[PDB]
């Protein structure tokens, strides 16, 4: 019981999306995590025409998110994030926010209006430090 209640909420969603009536001018925007899991009856076009994947960033889009966050920010240095555009070990777009947020904390933490580009590396190593043991084992 109650797992067919979940399953019938799908069916009511499939009906009022592609039933007889064809409710015009309504628009449906859906967003998930991993979408290989879900029902192929959703994924047929006529119902869910657009399939848009978001990558993490890549390079040349790290630059653009670096620009748009530091634009509204008193960076004002001659030490650039160019060293940190080209790093490997990819870094999701919400984390670029947190790098500038952590340096924003760490600029005021020593009572500065300004980011002095040694805090920038402390902010970088804070957000990226995750895999630490692996037991020197199974490589």
């Amino acid at each position: 019981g109650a797992d067919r209640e979940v399953q019938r909420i799908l069916l009511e969603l499939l009906n009022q999306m592609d039933g007889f009536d064809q409710n015009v001018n309504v628009k449906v925007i859906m967003a998930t995590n991993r979408a290989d899991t879900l029902d192929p009856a959703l994924l047929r076009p006529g119902r869910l025409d657009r399939k848009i994947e978001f990558p993490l960033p890549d390079r040349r889009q790290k630059r653009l998110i670096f620009s748009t966050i530091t634009s509204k920010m008193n960076l004002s240095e001659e030490v650039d994030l160019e060293d940190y555009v080209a790093r490997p070990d990819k870094i999701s777009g919400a984390d670029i926010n947190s790098i500038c947020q952590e340096s924003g904390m760490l600029a005021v933490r020593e009572n500065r209006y300004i980011v002095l580009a040694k805090d920038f590396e402390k902010a970088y190593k804070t957000v990226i430090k995750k895999d630490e043991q692996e037991h020197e084992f199974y490589k």
């Binding site: 037991h135 020197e136 199974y138």
Partner: protein
Amino acid sequence: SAGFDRHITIFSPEGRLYQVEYAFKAINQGGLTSVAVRGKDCAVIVTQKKVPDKLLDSSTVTHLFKITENIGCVMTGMTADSRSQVQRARYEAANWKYKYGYEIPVDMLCKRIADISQVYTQNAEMRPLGCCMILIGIDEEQGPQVYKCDPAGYYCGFKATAAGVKQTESTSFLEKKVKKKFDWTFEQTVETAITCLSTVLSIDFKPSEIEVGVVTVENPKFRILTEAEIDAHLVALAE
């Protein structure tokens, strides 16, 4: 979790297996920490003891174990599994001398020890010996060496070594220590082998709470230090 309950030694869908990596935290119930340092022609083991009772003796407590005349070791982890691990080490060191007619290298002995631990992972139906082993020895045309053998069957050779409870703290010191260019002239070695442990645990013994094994290319015999000369080096780094 995905939760296979990890009762026996099989895989998990993540790709790893949990029973062997539960043996790595089996060392930590010893409540102990050991350090090996290789700097120059000498190599130093240092390890504290813990005597909780006056009725308990002093001579029968030592974790320094002489394997051969020129190879010694120290054992961490739980006690009963550690001594049976030494018996295979003493046994297969003597088969080398019998079969092959010369003294076993310190590098080859860890291959034999790690392969015994590998079968207990690969084949089931024996508990995989929750203890760790650190060796020292002199090898001609190679200098001295330090090796560590894991319960998983992993071994590697490296200069500064920590084991026991406080690996990550002691190894953090020795990276900060062994990054410069020292020559490690046998009192440089022993002093840091104390002072790597002498940032960590905040203890203050009078000189009867540790053990120090040593080997040197002037006398390649394995050698356990005297309480008097332990006291000598304890005030020699130390003005």
